[PDB]
Write a protein that binds this DNA or RNA. Sequence first.
DNA 1: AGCCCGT
DNA 2: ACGGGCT
Lengths: 8, 10
Amino acid sequence: XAXVXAXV
Amino acid sequence: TXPGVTXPGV
DNA sequence: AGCCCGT
DNA sequence: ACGGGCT
Ligand SMILES: *C(=O)c1cnc2ccccc2n1
Ligand SMILES: *C(=O)c1cnc2ccccc2n1
Ligand SMILES: [Cl-]
Ligand SMILES: [Cl-]
Ligand SMILES: [K+]
Ligand SMILES: [Zn+2]
Ligand SMILES: [Zn+2]
Ligand SMILES: [Zn+2]
Ligand SMILES: [Zn+2]
Ligand SMILES: [Zn+2]
């Protein structure tokens, strides 16, 4: 749930 | 990093 | 060549 | 159940 590379 | 040496991240 | 996350 | 972004 973070988006630092994926954003789920 | 940076750019350079994005971020992290983005 | 250069890093690292939270619901 | 998840991989991104220029100097
Ligand atoms: C977002 O909070 C979060 C936390 N853990 C994960 C594990 C695997 C895929 C996505 C995730 N997202
Ligand atoms: C996003 O593309 C990405 C890839 N690897 C990671 C490792 C650890 C924390 C965050 C990350 N994000
Ligand atoms: Cl060298
Ligand atoms: Cl990974
Ligand atoms: K080198
Ligand atoms: Zn390169
Ligand atoms: Zn790692
Ligand atoms: Zn975690
Ligand atoms: Zn991964
Ligand atoms: Zn990548």
